Amino acid sequence: DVSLKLSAKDIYEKDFEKTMARGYRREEVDAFLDDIIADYQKMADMNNEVVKLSEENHKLKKELEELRLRVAT
Template sequence: MDNIKFTPQDILHKQFKEKSIGKGYDVDDVDGFLDDVIKDYDTYNKEVARLQDENERLKAKVDELNRQLEIGSSIGAAAPASQPVVSSTTNMDILKRLSNLERRVFGSQLGDDGDSHLL
């Protein structure tokens, strides 16, 4: 956004030079100003598109983290009564639980890498 030259107030209060001969404004002055306004609009459009992309990416990440949290909660709910479920589960705890569950369920399909004794 550092490339933006004009604020809406700058555009509103812009005064063009009048021609010394004849009536009207200096065409080069008006054209130069409009060229700069167009560049600003291009910069704004690019920034809006970038922010929209980032917003979508972050929304997808939040959705994925919520799914992971739900998986972690369902694993915690399925734990035996003798093991208390801690409500302040960290993301690392959830990932460890998910990894252990994947090893138990898919261990034989993942290939033997010497961890089969952990199953």
């Protein structure tokens, strides 16, 4: 819900099918993806932090639920 679907490496490993005519200019698409890649790289740390906090959030909530059940023995 909150973390990125794609990573920098998904973007810079991506290639597209080629068409004989009326496709998009390759130099223009590649230059645009150059900047997109740079943005994903810049976001990597913050996205790693949101994933780590999310998984730890889930683990804390689960242990809290388990222990609250234990004290209600």
